[PDB]
Design a protein around this nucleic acid. Structure first.
Ligand SMILES: [Mg+2]
Ligand SMILES: [Mg+2]
Ligand SMILES: [Mg+2]
Ligand SMILES: [Mg+2]
Ligand SMILES: [Mg+2]
Ligand SMILES: [Mg+2]
Ligand SMILES: [Mg+2]
Ligand SMILES: [Mg+2]
Ligand SMILES: [Mg+2]
Ligand SMILES: [Mg+2]
Ligand SMILES: [Mg+2]
Ligand SMILES: [Mg+2]
Ligand SMILES: [Mg+2]
Ligand SMILES: [Mg+2]
Ligand SMILES: [Mg+2]
Ligand SMILES: [Mg+2]
Ligand SMILES: [Mg+2]
Ligand SMILES: [Mg+2]
Ligand SMILES: [Mg+2]
Length: 67
RNA sequence: UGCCCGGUGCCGGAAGGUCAAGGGGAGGGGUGCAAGCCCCGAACCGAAGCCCCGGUGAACGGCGGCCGUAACUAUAACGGU
C-alpha cells in the first residue's frame, strides 16, 4: 500500500508533467493546476510562500464546493 | 575437476636446538699403615627421532560474518570494516 500510493504522487512523468514550473529566465513561477503566474521566485525560491499556496487551496475548495 | 600447505600425514633438507648407551674423568666419597681396592661424578665428544627450515591435495582435511549503497518500493553490480 506504500508503493501503490507513492507511485501515483511522484508520477513517472518527471520529465515534465504535473504541478509547477520555475522560470529562471524571466522569473515566472507558475502552477499549471489553475494558471496563476507571477514573479515571486525571489520571494518563494529564496524563502516561504504560505500565501501563494492559498489560491491552490482556495481554488481547490470551489473545485469541490460548487459541484 | 577451482582456492587454501597455517594443523596432521608423506617427501626433501650434512645448518642449528634437544637427545640414550658408550667415550671422557675436572672434582668428590668409602676402606687400608700402606702400595692399593672400590663407588659416585662436571666440562666435553656422541645416532635415529623430535624441534626447526621448505615441498606436497586424484595426501588427511577446510573452503566466513557484519553494515551501507542505484530512476516508485524491492533488490544491490559498487563500497566500508
Ligand atoms: Mg576461487
Ligand atoms: Mg594445508
Ligand atoms: Mg603441510
Ligand atoms: Mg603459504
Ligand atoms: Mg589429524
Ligand atoms: Mg623428513
Ligand atoms: Mg647436529
Ligand atoms: Mg654419560
Ligand atoms: Mg667410565
Ligand atoms: Mg660414564
Ligand atoms: Mg680426578
Ligand atoms: Mg675416608
Ligand atoms: Mg685414609
Ligand atoms: Mg640428530
Ligand atoms: Mg580437488
Ligand atoms: Mg591435480
Ligand atoms: Mg581429503
Ligand atoms: Mg585443517
Ligand atoms: Mg536506495
Amino acid at each position: 500500500a506504500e508503493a501503490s500510493t507513492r507511485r501515483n504522487l511522484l508520477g513517472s512523468g518527471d520529465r515534465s508533467d504535473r504541478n509547477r514550473t520555475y522560470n529562471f529566465p524571466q522569473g515566472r513561477v507558475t502552477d499549471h493546476r489553475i494558471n496563476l503566474t507571477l514573479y515571486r521566485l525571489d520571494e518563494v525560491m529564496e524563502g516561504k510562500l504560505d500565501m501563494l499556496i492559498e489560491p491552490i487551496i482556495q481554488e481547490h475548495q470551489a473545485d469541490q464546493l460548487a459541484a
